[PDB]
């Protein structure tokens, strides 16, 4: 499920441009039932009357820094020993390879594993894409009446445009650079 897939993902944090209170974006909407309102509608601070939806520039900018931090962390290349007793962490990649993969230089019988697997990076990117994807957030509702009620009350064409702007900010990174591309030549030849 979506909840269990994104459990290990780091939640997106962004200070409010007006009051400075840290906000929480873990899903498109917050709450349940009648009070299921978009997370970008109002600030987390009660006294704050500024709409975070207005500050789309700051949200996208902070998303930019967060994604850059994540991709640099992945390209750092940190490896960890699988053996609980060794726990060897090295930045230099040894050329001594076993059947499973790299061989630890401290202990001679173990396989080094990447600290940040590609699956984790792709899951984090998908979580960032999903938290601002209202198109799939509206079709998830089992009732069309509630979907229309929520669409006509807050999801104005400008609001939908801002949400699509965030989704396209994610999709610029998710579009060409990837992981979902499978080379048939390497698979067969």
């Amino acid at each position: 499920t979506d909840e269990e897939k994104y459990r290990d993902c780091e939640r997106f944090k962004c200070p409010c441009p007006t009051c400075g209170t840290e906000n929480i974006y873990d899903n498109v909407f917050d709450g349940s039932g009648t009070d299921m309102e978009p997370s970008l509608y109002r600030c987390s601070n009660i006294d704050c009357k500024a709409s975070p939806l207005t500050f789309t520039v700051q949200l996208s900018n902070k998303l930019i820094m967060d994604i850059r931090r994540f991709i640099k962390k992945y390209y750092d290349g940190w490896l960890i020993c699988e053996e609980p007793t060794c726990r060897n962490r090295t930045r230099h990649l040894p050329l001594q390879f076993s059947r499973t993969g790299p061989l630890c230089p401290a202990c001679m019988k173990a396989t080094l594993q990447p600290e940040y697997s590609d699956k984790s990076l792709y899951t984090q990117l998908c979580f960032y894409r999903y938290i601002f994807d209202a198109e799939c957030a509206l079709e998830k509702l089992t009732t069309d009446h509630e979907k229309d009620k929520l669409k006509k009350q807050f999801f104005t064409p400008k609001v939908l445009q801002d949400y699509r702007k965030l989704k396209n900010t994610a999709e610029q990174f998710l579009s060409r650079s990837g992981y979902s591309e499978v080379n048939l030549s390497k698979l067969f030849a």
Partner: protein, 422 residues
């Protein structure tokens, strides 16, 4: 280039998205499955067979008659689909024959629809080295060919062209003295060339399938392709609703066992005994029990002989049809709690006892259990009060204040649940 029929060689080199990767496999599986239905329910010559098969080929965007130039997309679709499906149906010997038979049938259909005159270029485009004869040559050898003809009635040498082939490639024909041989060259009617084309395609297809299977461990290393290589053959009381009961009436232990059987297509001995005896308890007989177990084990890519000589004896003995002929009572909940503790690779036992709270919490969560009920169940488990916790689970999933009974047997659980549900 004749993209409407093609001997599948020269594997492609393009790259595609994974969504299209799965869509191509599922579409090819659907088409090849429907070829089975068309070939079984009908006969190979009716117009309805041709109409239905070509309509379905049109529906799934696949190549057909060559009279309309640029259908490059269906060509690419079929080319990628065959090679992507080669990886899956090459594992078990019960699936290789299924693949080959229906692919040969599809190629026969595609061959029968070539209009009349683009066949010659195709024969050269598939590395076959065949030839035709002009009208004067046909008239020169007319009597010789009709004399050399098979039991085909009549001397009338119709408009069907006569093909010229190296003799070694016509082994199935000149062995029976049914063709004409001259200067080391065989002359054949157009009707019989289909047999040799399919026979020569079959050997290459089988060789390609074999050479892919042994170099397929290298491809399992990819973690994104595991679902595809293993789930292309996946998917009073009757068989066609038990899954529903798994969500509705079963206790968490037996529901866990059913989920394990559905997913892993196998179970260890303790789970086998426990689930089988409970499944007898609900009311199944021997025939459908054997049906259920064999259906659940064949999906594990094992042939029926292994199941029949391995597990059928134990399954029959469970009901009391061999040995002393003793019929057994389903396990009491106390022995489930206390006897035969589970280990790694095993899924049997009582979840409320053997499973740690750090896993029992999400076990309750995945079953739409309210957080207050979750906390109460955790408190009861910490107090070693298991039966009342299972009763509370029953009340919460049944939306009643009190169940009205004391639980000591999962069969009692199921009977009480079905008392109100039905």
């Amino acid at each position: 280039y004749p993209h409407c029929l093609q001997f599948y060689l020269q594997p492609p080199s393009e790259n595609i998205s994974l969504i299209e990767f799965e869509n191509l496999a599922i579409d090819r599986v659907k088409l090849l499955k429907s070829v089975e239905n068309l070939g079984v329910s009908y006969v190979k010559g009716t117009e309805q067979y041709q109409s239905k098969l070509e309509s379905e080929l049109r529906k799934l965007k696949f190549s057909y008659r060559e009279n309309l130039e640029d259908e490059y997309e269906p060509r690419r679709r079929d080319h990628i689909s065959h090679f992507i499906l080669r990886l899956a149906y090459c594992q078990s010997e019960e699936l290789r024959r299924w693949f080959i038979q229906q692919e040969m049938d599809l190629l026969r259909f595609r061959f029968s629809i070539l209009p009349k005159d683009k066949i010659q270029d195709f024969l050269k485009d598939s590395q076959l080295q065949f030839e035709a004869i002009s009208d004067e040559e046909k008239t020169l050898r007319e009597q010789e060919i009709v004399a050399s003809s098979p039991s085909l009635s009549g001397l009338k040498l119709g408009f069907e062209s006569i093909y010229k082939i190296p003799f070694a490639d016509a082994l199935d024909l000149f062995r029976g003295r049914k063709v004409y041989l001259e200067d080391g060259f065989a002359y054949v009617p157009l009707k019989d060339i289909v047999a040799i084309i399919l026979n020569e395609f079959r050997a290459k297809l089988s060789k390609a399938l074999a050479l892919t299977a042994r170099s397929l461990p290298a491809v399992q290393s990819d973690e994104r392709l595991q679902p595809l290589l293993n789930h292309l053959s996946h998917s009073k009381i009757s068989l066609d609703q038990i899954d529903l009961l798994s969500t509705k009436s079963f206790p968490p232990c037996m529901r866990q066992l059913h989920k394990a059987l559905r997913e892993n297509h196998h179970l260890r001995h303790g789970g086998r005994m426990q689930y089988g005896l409970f499944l007898k308890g609900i009311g199944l007989t021997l025939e459908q029990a054997l049906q259920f177990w064999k259906q659940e084990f064949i999906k594990g890519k094992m042939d029926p002989d292994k199941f029949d000589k391995g597990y059928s004896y134990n399954i029959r003995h469970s009901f009391g049809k061999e040995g002393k002929r003793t019929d057994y009572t389903p396990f009491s909940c106390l022995k489930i709690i206390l006897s035969n503790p589970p280990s790694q690779g095993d899924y049997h036992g009582c979840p409320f006892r053997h499973s740690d709270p750090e896993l029992l919490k999400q076990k309750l969560q995945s079953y739409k259990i309210s957080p207050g009920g979750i906390s109460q169940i955790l408190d009861l488990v910490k107090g070693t009060h298991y039966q009342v916790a299972c009763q509370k689970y029953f009340e919460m999933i049944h939306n009643v204040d009190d169940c009205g009974f004391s639980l000591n047997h999962p069969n009692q659980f199921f009977c009480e649940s079905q008392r109100i549900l039905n």
